[PDB]
């Protein structure tokens, strides 16, 4: 009869980070669930970072564009730090167009019907002339962990940034003593996370508990052609349909085409379904051609 | 290559990178590939390991297994500066060397480098296992004092 | 592994055929030592 | 994105009936320590029993 | 006309009892195919070959259609109204040309295509020998055993194919 | 020409510049080598010349010298050490007249120093020059001793003058044993520039001299107002109280973008000024490699903890979190130059064209129609960059073997592949292709493409020189015609090139408009003749090797990140091969939540006596504590009064010091931008032998809310349970060295 | 396999161990003889030293078996001839 | 594992683009735009025969229209409601 943890209070003290609260816990389970959920939340949570950038007049990422006071490499770092939420897609392509003296903030991206920028004050670069304009396409996708560029581009105009698909920054639990409910030696687990805005905190603690309980699921509560047609698991009629053409081994059935068998009325409509059920295992009737009987492994000794 | 620690090792084995392992053991991999029947001519095998397909790493773990290598630090002064290990393959580019053995090589880890040599023939594999293995050198030959002292 | 050219081609055939065995022969650089000492007035040989 | 590598215990290499050595493979990178620590603290700290 | 054109054609290694002008046209079509392989306009490479002078030219196609794909070889009947409806549906009516492009691989591939053309030069001889004596009755010697096909070789560089069916 | 070209070409002293760092330039140029012609040799001599004599004090640095086969022969000259009229060494002193230290400097040679008696640099004196003790430590004739108050004749100038500029950027130098200071100065010379260089939190204030007084930054010549910033160029409009009367003048700084250094690093220049910003004479405009705002940022500063962690830092090794490699913060950028020449042999010359035997679509898809790889094509190890085929040789002519060799006007024919390839192992991205052609040889289509490209670039650049300087000249005409016959409406009715025949008598203003007309017609005819000369320079061939057709140079740009096997090191001799790149979760964190980045080994401290790194660690944690409090007081959107209060308290904080700043003359907008620059930490200068004592570090750790002893208790990442006996964390400024592991393997 | 201590306990020279194990591994690898101990897909070197540790192979038994399996071949040849 | 699992059961495009945005010259867009068309969807709403019955398009404009229709994204003889398809929905 262990007391079970239930989420009690989600104090969204700022826009980035929150303090979820678990209560009650028997003594010992505080540090266990704290370290466990901390390590799951830092390890593998679904983030929504960026993968590819294609600036228009830029060949390689080491060049410079006329009219922007940062290099193309610095624009790639500033886009690598972009904090963006997607809702109903695997990957998505965002479009950016901006012209005029001043910054190119992150709110200048033409947003789609589901993409949501969570920090629109994020600077990318600074345009610095009256007719000097950038126009880029950004590719944002889901993922898990840290997928660099060296592991995973076909034209020369794509630019690959590294992909830090990770929404959280700093997970700190602080166990502490618990009051009434009329029993002492109980504990409270208070987890202050640090999100970048792309993940709801109760959704984060729910996905972490689902991942951990999935991990404990591990310990919690041709021979068909050589065999005869009659040896098949199906009924005797399915074997007799092939056997009417003087066939005794399924290798003889594999030697002849299915179209050649369908051009003979000795097979029936239910026999065709039985032949399809037999060919679903792909051991027989795969459209092969033998010498007469024997393959090389089927040799006479 | 440059050495590094890797303290999970047992003292008869050392870490050896996959890229160096596929380069030093090209003829054994060629012989293994020609035995299975995956390819035919030698050229095909050299294209396979030039491309590094998915099947040559199992070939590589089947040529490594009981085949010692001679690690050697570059100023070898006494005989404990050439010792034979068994490779354990490393994702990386640095030889992982068991720490106790370092006091024999006078090897710290401040930028040191070591050379690996492969005993080709069968008498040389047996000499690496029976005379030059790192489990066999636990006493310094200059005296009676143990050379696998914890540093 | 180092010097003898017929020795190392025999070795490469023997390794890709699974027969771990060496046919030793002579280092070719020792024949270079014989030619450099012999190119003086000195008559170095190999007896028997 | 949610479907990890899910393990199963490959062998229970046991000495006599009150002692065992149970392995687990393959686990996702960093999960060996969290399952070892969770099972270690639960077994070593809070089990039901009589003495 | 670098007069080298009339000294590479007459090898004559494996080429004799076979159509000379047709082999010339086939080599011309191979060279124009390579010229259309390094081009952009996805159309048909028509080579036009002369027998009297030996020299040749390369024409592009326009390929009269009722469709829009292969757009550098796409034409229609309303566009044929400017030609006073003289084009019909389906034709490969050529209405463009091309000039030249040089490379050692260009001649290498051409020589490789000429080697295959000359060899086609070693396949058309056995592609008429079988029908040279009606339905013979022709002894053969199995040279290579292919998968569900027995290749045989006869005299005067002849090749036969035995079907397992 | 043979004699002077042989001396500058190959001598024993005309050596190849170790250029991978501004420090390495400015300390290779200041080198006093004993070797070479007329001096001694390494494998012969000796004992005494490899030893520091008592008269190296303030002339030749005692601690910066290369260890190995030549110690003490490759001496490095000190900071204040000039060279005398004859060629000897001389150093400044302060003439201590009978009671008072007079502030005149006075250069002493090596034999004039011996007769007199010189007071030590850090002797306490009370605001007049009177020595506050009555026994003062001095040195008379090469021998240190203790002398009386007013028998002294000279005092040292500053306490930084025994050391060189290699080993005066080491904070807390007086706490390190001299061997570890030697190894620290030498490895600080051997650093590599990272991708985004940060700053030193614990410097010595000597960074600005090494950055500005070298030649990697773009120092302003005449001050003024910035007009146009770009990643390529920077335009300064010169102030009128600094400006010539003629040659109207607005300066253009053409920065040096991504190009190859000698050590295959990436010598970049980034503009660090905004637009509309005032700049003063003698000031940085564009940061260089390993610089930041005019300072000198070699490596980066990271959160370090001293604890043994499960053996992975056994001898000297370093253990680094994945948070470091995720932030792309040691990701250095290297550039390799690959050359391919078109020589002249028998059977004929070579071919660079892409009609190549033995290859198919999969190779030739990454080449253009003329052999040379594209600019921007990201290649692998072993592709083809330049396709090159030589005369294979007819040799045996077959049916088809001798056939058509006759049909093509190109005798080569099959050829022998000798195409340039990427050497096996390196990736990259081709950033720059040069094609040089010996004159007479037919330019192919890509060489004409590069010729049109550079013609277009130089045409645009000289036309923009004329347009920008004409814009400055017309702004001068508008500035002159404010007074004396001003036309407020009539000025912009007529075309702008005639601003001279307006109503104005014979004064200095019509004289000045005539002088500007002289300047303008000079610019017109000069632009004509210079564009003709630049078309000549682009169009001409180049004299080259005997028997070469054309040279193709291709610049690969690899980006090498970090991996187990690289060498990192601090600034005190604490070396180490990084041994395991851990995940984020396994790191020891504290009771706030933040993981530590790097876990060093404590056992290297009592034997290798470099105790200065622990004081640098504690003072770096103090600096970051002040930075975190600024970040907390600014993230809460607080008004400038509380920021002014806290920044003033953090800048006073000490004994009698030199700084004495006040923020009451910064006017409420600079304080916000100064706090925008301090929020990632507060930089602290600590001069060499006059540094921050222990009580000042304690009082600065008390200003932040950090623990006094510097040690935070740290939890574990694996077990999640506390480490006993709380451990030392802080920030150490660590350098990546260019002894990487995928260059040795 | 880690240590070869008992393989020297049964052949005291520690240099004759290498000759006997090399002779044994050359008989098992190219000559095509079966191992006398059941393996675990070990290489022929470790199977040689594993037969040394059981005691069922040293130089005496190898000379006995080479003389008997040379006399067997020549006896088969003589009974085939006569 | 049963204890730890029981302690977690309370948790677990060419038509939409403008005619001027086409890669061709401004004359090819202006030929369609002379009939008060701003989107290529309006060009796809009308037949090519109906456009050929108006002299506002030119001979070179017909070739440009053929080059645009070679990609088969526009002028494929379609019929819309007025503007919007179902995927083009108002949100």
Domain holding E15, by residue range, is: 4-128
CB A53 within 8 A of CB A136: yes
Q: What is the chain D residue with the closest CA to F718?
A: D33
| Residues F284 and F406 placed together within one structural domain of the fold | no
Q: Do D2 and A211 touch (CB under 8 A)?
A: yes
Query: Could you tell me which residues of chain C have a Cβ less than 8 Å from any Cβ in chain B?
Result: 1, 11-12, 15-18, 20-22
- Of F602, F607, F628, F608, nearest to F729 by C-alpha is F602
- Of F639, F705, F644, nearest to F674 by C-alpha is F644
N- to C-terminal Cα separation, chain G: 50
**Under CATH, which architecture does the A47-165 domain have?**
Beta Complex (2.170)
- CB neighbour class for A214 (10 Å; exposed up to 12, middle 13-18, buried from 19): middle
Cβ–Cβ contact E147 with A under 8 A = yes
| Residues F537 and F501 placed together within one structural domain of the fold | yes
The domains found in chain G, sorted by start residue, are 1-82 (3.90.940.10)
In angstroms, this model's resolution equals: 3.5
Size of interface D-F (CB pairs under 8 A): 9
DSSP F373: B
Query: Could you tell me which residues of chain F have a Cβ less than 8 Å from any Cβ in chain D?
Result: 583, 585-586, 718-720
Q: Do F741 and B6 touch (CB under 8 A)?
A: no
Rounded to 5 degrees, what angle do the CA atoms B95, B96, B98 make? Answer: 135
Pairing type for strands A6-7 and A19-26 reads: antiparallel
Rounded to 5 degrees, what angle do the CA atoms F458, F460, F461 make? Answer: 60
**Under CATH, which architecture does the A1-46+166-221 domain have?**
2-Layer Sandwich (3.30)
Q: Do A4 and H6 touch (CB under 8 A)?
A: yes
- Of F353, F343, F351, nearest to F392 by C-alpha is F351
Cβ–Cβ contact D38 with H under 8 A = yes
CA dist., res. A21 & res. A190, Å (int)? 5
Cα A296 to chain centroid distance, Å, stands at 43
CA dist., res. A61 & res. F558, Å (int)? 12
Q: Do G2 and B10 touch (CB under 8 A)?
A: yes
Preceding-residue numbers of gaps in chain B (C–N over 2.5 Å) = none
| Residues F577 and F721 placed together within one structural domain of the fold | yes
Interface of B with F in 98-127 (CB under 8 A): 99, 102, 107-113
- Of F552, F64, F54, nearest to F338 by C-alpha is F552
Decide: A and G in contact? Rule: 3+ Cβ pairs under 8 Å.
no
Determine the topology of domain A222-295 in CATH.
Answer: DNA polymerase; domain 1 (1.10.150)
CA dist., res. F649 & res. F641, Å (int)? 12
F740 by DSSP, 3-state: which?
coil
CB G4 within 8 A of CB B130: yes
The nearest CA of chain H is from the CA of A88 a distance in Å of 15
Nearest residue, CB atoms, C1 vs list B28, B35, B120: B120
Tell me the chain E residues in contact with residue H67 when contact means C-beta distances shorter than 8 Å.
71
CB E61 within 8 A of CB E41: no
The set of long-range contacts for E125-129, using a CB threshold of 8 Å and a minimum separation of 24, is: E125/E17, E125/E18, E125/E156, E125/E157, E125/E158, E126/E154, E126/E157, E126/E158, E126/E159, E126/E160, E129/E154, E129/E156, E129/E158
Nearest residue, CB atoms, E74 vs list H52, H62, H70: H70
What method was applied to determine this entry? cryo-EM
| Residues F550 and F566 placed together within one structural domain of the fold | no
| Residues F362 and F494 placed together within one structural domain of the fold | no
CA dist., res. F129 & res. F150, Å (int)? 11
CA dist., res. D51 & res. D30, Å (int)? 37
- Of A50, A9, A250, nearest to A147 by C-alpha is A50
- Of F441, F701, F714, nearest to F589 by C-alpha is F714
Rounded to 5 degrees, what angle do the CA atoms F113, F80, F610 make? Answer: 100
The nearest CA of chain H is from the CA of D31 a distance in Å of 15
Cβ–Cβ contact C16 with G under 8 A = no
CB H40 within 8 A of CB H13: no
DSSP F158: -
Domain limits, chain A:
1-46+166-221, 47-165, 222-295
F731 by DSSP, 3-state: which?
strand
CB proximity list for F37: less than 8 A, separation 6 or greater? F11, F12, F13
Pairing type for strands F291-292 and F568-569 reads: unpaired
| Residues F208 and F220 placed together within one structural domain of the fold | no
The set of long-range contacts for F534-541, using a CB threshold of 8 Å and a minimum separation of 24, is: F534/F458, F534/F462, F535/F455, F538/F451, F538/F454, F538/F455, F538/F458, F539/F451, F540/F439, F541/F437, F541/F438, F541/F439, F541/F440, F541/F441
Cβ–Cβ contact D35 with H under 8 A = no
Query: Could you tell me which residues of chain B have a Cβ less than 8 Å from any Cβ in chain G?
Result: 10, 12, 65-67, 122-123, 125-127, 129-131, 133, 135-136
Pairing type for strands F202-203 and F684-685 reads: parallel
- Of A206, A174, A200, A220, nearest to A40 by C-alpha is A206
Q: Do F745 and B93 touch (CB under 8 A)?
A: yes
The CATH number covering residue E120 comes to 3.30.1480.10
Domain holding F244, by residue range, is: 216-290
Cα B149 to chain centroid distance, Å, stands at 22
CB A187 within 8 A of CB A26: yes
CB F71 within 8 A of CB F47: no
CA dist., res. E107 & res. F351, Å (int)? 14
- Of F156, F138, F162, F160, nearest to F148 by C-alpha is F138
What radius of gyration do chain G's Cα atoms show?
Answer: 15
CB F108 within 8 A of CB F93: yes
Q: Do F311 and B3 touch (CB under 8 A)?
A: no
CB G56 within 8 A of CB G36: yes
Cβ–Cβ contact B120 with C under 8 A = yes
Q: Do F314 and B1 touch (CB under 8 A)?
A: no
CATH number of the domain at H13-85, out of 2.60.120.380, 3.90.550.10, 1.10.150.20, 1.10.286.10?
A: 1.10.150.20
Q: Give me the residues paired with residue B13 across strands.
A: B86
CA dist., res. A149 & res. A146, Å (int)? 10
CA distances in angstroms from A276 to A141, A226, A252, F128, H57, listed in the order given = 41, 19, 17, 108, 59
| Residues F575 and F682 placed together within one structural domain of the fold | yes
| Residues F97 and F210 placed together within one structural domain of the fold | no
Q: Which residues of H40-74 are buried (b: 16+ CB within 10 A; e: fewer)?
A: bbbbbbbebeebeeeeebeeebbebbbbbbbeeeb
CB proximity list for A254: less than 8 A, separation 6 or greater? A222, A225, A284, A285, A286, A288, A290
SS (H, E, C) chain B: CEEECCCCCCCCEEEEEHHHHHHHCHHHHHHHHHHHCCCCCHHHHHHHHHHCCCCHHHHHHHHHCCCCEEEEECCCCCHHHEEEEEEEEECCCCEECCHHHHHHHCCCCCCCEEEEECCCCHHHHHHHHHCCECCCCCECCCCCCECCCCC
Tell me the chain F residues in contact with residue A146 when contact means C-beta distances shorter than 8 Å.
322, 326
The nearest CA of chain D is from the CA of A144 a distance in Å of 7
Nearest residue, CB atoms, H12 vs list A33, A209, A219: A209
Nearest residue, CB atoms, E68 vs list H52, H62, H69: H69
Task: Please state, as a whole number, how many other Cβ atoms lie within 10 Å of the Cβ of residue F425.
Answer: 11
Q: Give me the residues paired with residue F131 across strands.
A: F125
CA dist., res. F403 & res. F341, Å (int)? 30
CB proximity list for F237: less than 8 A, separation 6 or greater? F224, F225, F226, F227, F250, F472
N- to C-terminal Cα separation, chain H: 48
The set of long-range contacts for E51-60, using a CB threshold of 8 Å and a minimum separation of 24, is: E51/E21, E51/E24, E53/E1, E54/E1, E54/E5, E54/E6, E55/E1, E55/E5, E56/E28, E57/E97, E58/E32, E58/E97, E58/E98, E58/E99, E58/E100, E59/E94, E59/E96, E59/E97, E59/E98, E60/E94, E60/E95, E60/E96, E60/E97, E60/E98
Q: Give me the residues paired with residue F74 across strands.
A: none
CA dist., res. D51 & res. F373, Å (int)? 80
- Of C24, F257, F337, F185, nearest to A69 by C-alpha is F257
CB A35 within 8 A of CB A191: no
The alpha-helical segments, DSSP class H, found in F564-719 are 604-607, 612-635, 640-652, 670-678, 694-703
Helices (H) and strands (E) in chain G, counts: 4, 0
The CATH number covering residue F278 comes to 2.40.50.100
CA dist., res. B71 & res. F87, Å (int)? 53
DSSP E73: G
Interface with chain F: mutation pick from E7, E107, E113, highest number of F CBs within 10 Å: E107
Query: From start to end of chain E, where are the E strands?
Result: 45-49, 56-60, 96-97, 142-146, 149-154, 158-163
């Amino acid at each position: 009869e262990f007391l079970k943890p239930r989420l009690v209070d989600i104090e969204q003290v700022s826009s980035t980070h929150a303090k979820v609260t678990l209560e009650p816990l028997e003594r010992g389970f505080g540090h266990t669930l704290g370290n466990a959920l901390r390590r799951i939340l830092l390890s593998s949570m679904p983030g929504c970072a960026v993968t590819e950038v294609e600036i228009d007049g830029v060949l390689h990422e080491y060049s410079t564009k006329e009219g922007v006071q940062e290099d193309i490499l610095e624009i790639l770092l500033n886009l690598k730090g972009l904090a963006v939420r997607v809702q109903g897609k695997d990957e998505v392509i965002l479009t950016l167009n901006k012209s005029g003296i001043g910054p190119v903030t992150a709110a200048d991206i033409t947003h789609d019907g589901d993409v949501e920028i969570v920090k629109p004050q994020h600077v990318i670069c600074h345009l610095t002339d009256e007719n000097a304009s950038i126009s880029m396409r950004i590719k944002v996708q889901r993922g898990r962990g840290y997928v660099p560029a060296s592991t995973r581009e076909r034209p020369i105009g794509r630019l690959l940034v590294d992909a830090c698909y990770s929404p959280v920054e700093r997970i700190a639990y602080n166990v502490e003593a618990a009051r009434v409910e009329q029993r002492t030696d109980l504990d409270k687990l208070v987890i202050e996370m640090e999100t970048n805005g792309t993940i709801d905190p109760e959704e984060a603690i729910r996905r972490a508990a689902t991942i951990l309980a999935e991990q404990l699921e591990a310990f919690v509560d041709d021979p068909i052609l050589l065999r005869p047609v009659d040896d098949l698991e199906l009924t005797v009629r399915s074997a007799n349909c092939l056997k009417a053409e003087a066939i005794h081994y399924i290798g003889d059935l594999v030697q002849r085409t299915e179209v050649e068998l369908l051009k003979t009325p000795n097979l029936g409509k239910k026999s065709l379904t039985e032949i399809k059920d037999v060919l679903a295992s792909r051991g027989l009737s795969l459209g092969m051609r033998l010498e007469n009987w024997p393959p090389a492994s089927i040799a006479d000794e | 290559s440059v050495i590094t620690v890797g303290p999970y090792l047992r003292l008869h084995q050392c870490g050896l990178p996959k890229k160096m392992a596929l380069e030093l053991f090209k003829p054994f991999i060629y012989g293994k590939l020609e035995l299975r029947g995956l390819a035919t001519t030698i050229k095909a095998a050299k294209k396979m390991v030039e491309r590094e397909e998915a099947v040559v790493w199992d070939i590589l773990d089947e040529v490594i297994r009981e085949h010692p290598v001679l690690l050697n630090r570059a100023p070898t002064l006494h005989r404990l500066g050439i010792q034979a290990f068994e490779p354990v393959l490393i994702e990386g580019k640095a030889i992982q060397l068991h720490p106790l053995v370092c006091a024999a090589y006078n090897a710290d880890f401040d930028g040191d480098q070591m050379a690996v040599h492969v005993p080709l023939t069968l008498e040389a594999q047996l000499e690496a296992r029976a005379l030059m293995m790192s489990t066999n050198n636990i006493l310094s030959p200059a005296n009676g004092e143990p050379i696998i002292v914890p540093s | 592994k180092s010097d003898d050219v017929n020795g190392r081609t025999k070795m490469y055939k023997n390794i890709v055929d699974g027969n771990h065995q060496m046919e030793p022969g002579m280092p070719e650089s020792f024949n270079v030592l014989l030619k450099e000492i012999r190119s003086l007035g000195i008559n170095i040989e190999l007896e028997d | 994105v949610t479907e990890f590598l899910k393990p199963r215990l490959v062998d229970i290499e046991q000495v006599s009936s009150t002692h065992a050595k149970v392995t687990l493979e393959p686990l996702e990178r960093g999960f060996g320590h969290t399952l070892g620590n969770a099972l270690r603290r639960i077994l070593l700290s809070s089990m039901p029993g009589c003495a | 006309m670098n007069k080298e054109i009339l000294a590479v054609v007459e090898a004559v290694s494996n080429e004799k009892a076979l159509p000379r002008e047709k082999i010339f046209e086939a080599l011309e079509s191979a060279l124009a195919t390579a010229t259309k392989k390094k081009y952009e306009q996805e159309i048909d490479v028509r080579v036009q070959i002369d027998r009297k002078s030996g020299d040749f030219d390369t024409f592009r196609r326009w390929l009269v259609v009722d469709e829009v794909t292969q757009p550098t070889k796409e034409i229609t009947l309303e566009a044929a109204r400017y030609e006073d409806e003289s084009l019909n549906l389906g034709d490969y009516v050529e209405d463009q040309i091309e000039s030249v492009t040089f490379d050692r691989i260009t001649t290498q591939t051409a020589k490789q295509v000429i080697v295959q053309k000359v060899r086609e030069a070693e396949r058309a001889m056995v592609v008429d020998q079988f029908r040279e004596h009606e339905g013979e009755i022709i002894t053969g010697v199995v040279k290579k055993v292919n998968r569900d096909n027995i290749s045989l070789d006869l005299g005067n560089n002849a090749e036969a194919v035995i079907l397992r069916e | 020409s043979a004699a002077v070209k042989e001396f500058f070409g190959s001598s024993q002293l005309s050596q190849f510049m170790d250029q991978n760092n501004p420090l390495s330039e400015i300390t290779h140029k200041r080198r006093i080598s004993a070797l070479g012609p007329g001096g001694l040799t390494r494998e012969r001599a000796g004992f005494e010349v490899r030893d520091v004599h008592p008269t190296h004090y303030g002339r030749v640095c005692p601690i910066e010298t290369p260890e190995g086969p030549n110690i003490g022969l490759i001496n490095s000259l000190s900071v204040y050490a000039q060279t005398n009229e004859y060629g000897f060494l001389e150093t400044p002193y302060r003439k201590v007249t009978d009671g008072v230290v007079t502030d005149e400097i006075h250069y002493l040679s090596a034999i004039e120093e011996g007769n007199y008696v010189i007071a030590q640099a850090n002797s306490n004196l009370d605001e007049e020059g009177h020595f506050v003790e009555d026994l003062v430590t001095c040195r008379s004739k090469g021998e240190s001793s203790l002398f009386s108050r007013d028998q002294v004749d000279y005092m040292d100038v500053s306490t930084q003058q025994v050391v060189s500029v290699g080993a005066s950027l080491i904070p807390f130098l007086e706490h390190d044993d001299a061997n570890r200071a030697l190894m620290g100065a030498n490895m600080q010379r051997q650093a590599v520039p990272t991708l985004r260089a940060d700053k030193p939190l614990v410097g010595t204030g000597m960074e600005r001299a090494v950055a500005v007084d070298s030649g990697v930054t773009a120092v302003a010549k005449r001050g003024g107002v910035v007009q146009y910033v770009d990643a390529s160029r920077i335009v300064i409009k010169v102030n009128e109280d600094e400006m010539y009367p003629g040659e109207a003048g607005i300066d253009i700084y053409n920065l040096t973008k991504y190009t190859r250094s000698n050590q295959n690093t990436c010598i970049n220049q980034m503009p660090c000024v905004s637009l509309g910003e005032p700049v003063e004479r003698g000031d940085v405009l564009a940061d260089g490699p390993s610089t930041d705002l005019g300072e000198l940022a070699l490596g980066q500063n990271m959160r370090v903890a001293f604890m043994p962690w499960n053996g992975y830092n056994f001898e000297d090794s370093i253990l680094v979190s994945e948070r470091v490699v995720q932030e792309d913060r040691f990701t250095t950028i290297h550039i390799q130059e690959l050359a391919c020449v078109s020589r002249d042999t028998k059977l004929g010359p070579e071919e660079i064209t892409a009609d190549i035997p033995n290859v198919g679509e999969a190779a030739l898809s990454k080449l253009d129609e003329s052999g040379i790889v594209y600019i921007g094509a990201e290649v692998t190890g072993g592709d083809i960059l330049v396709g090159k085929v030589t005369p294979k040789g007819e040799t045996q002519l077959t049916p088809e073997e001798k056939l058509l060799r006759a049909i093509f006007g190109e005798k080569a024919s099959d050829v022998k592949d000798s195409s340039l390839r990427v050497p096996n192992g390196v990736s990259g991205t081709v950033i720059d292709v040069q094609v040089f052609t010996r004159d007479g040889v037919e330019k192919d289509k890509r060489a004409l493409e590069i010729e049109e490209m550079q013609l277009k670039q130089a045409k645009k650049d000289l036309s923009e020189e004329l347009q920008i300087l004409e814009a400055g000249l017309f702004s001068r005409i508008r500035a002159v015609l404010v007074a004396g016959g001003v036309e407020a409406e009539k000025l912009d009715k007529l075309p702008r090139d005639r601003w001279l025949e307006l109503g104005l008598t014979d004064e200095e203003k019509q004289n000045q408009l005539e002088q500007l007309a002289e300047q303008y017609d000079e610019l017109k005819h000069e632009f004509e003749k210079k564009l003709e000369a630049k078309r000549r320079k682009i169009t001409q061939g180049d004299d080259l090797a005997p028997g070469v057709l054309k040279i193709v140079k291709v610049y690969l740009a690899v980006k090498r990140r970090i991996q187990p096997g690289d060498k990192m090191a601090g600034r005190h001799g604490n070396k180490g091969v990084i041994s395991k790149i851990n995940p984020i979760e396994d790191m020891p964190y504290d009771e706030n939540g933040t993981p530590v980045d790097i876990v060093l080994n404590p056992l290297g401290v009592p034997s290798r006596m470099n105790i200065g790194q622990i004081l640098e660690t504690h003072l770096g944690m103090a600096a970051k504590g002040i930075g975190d409090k600024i970040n907390a007081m600014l993230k809460q959107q607080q008004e400038v009064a509380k920021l002014r209060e806290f920044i003033q308290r953090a800048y006073d904080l000490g004994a009698d010091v030199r700084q004495k700043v006040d923020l009451s003359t910064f006017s409420d907008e600079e304080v916000m931008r100064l706090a925008e620059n301090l929020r990632k930490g507060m930089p602290i200068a600590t001069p060499v032998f006059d540094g921050a004592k222990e009580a000042e570090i304690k009082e600065l750790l008390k200003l932040g809310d950090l623990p006094t002893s510097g040690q935070i208790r740290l939890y574990d990442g694996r077990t999640g349970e506390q480490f006993e006996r709380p451990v030392t964390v802080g920030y150490m400024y660590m350098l990546k060295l260019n002894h990487l592991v995928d260059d040795k393997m | 396999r880690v240590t070869v201590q008992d393989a020297v306990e049964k052949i005291g020279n520690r240099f004759d161990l290498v000759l006997v194990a090399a002779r044994r591994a050359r008989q098992m690898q190219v000559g095509g003889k079966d191992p006398l101990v059941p393996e675990e897909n070990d290489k022929t070197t470790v199977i040689a030293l594993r037969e040394i540790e059981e005691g069922l192979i040293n130089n005496q038994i190898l000379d006995v078996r080479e003389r008997q399996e040379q006399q067997e071949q020549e006896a088969a040849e003589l009974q085939a001839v006569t």
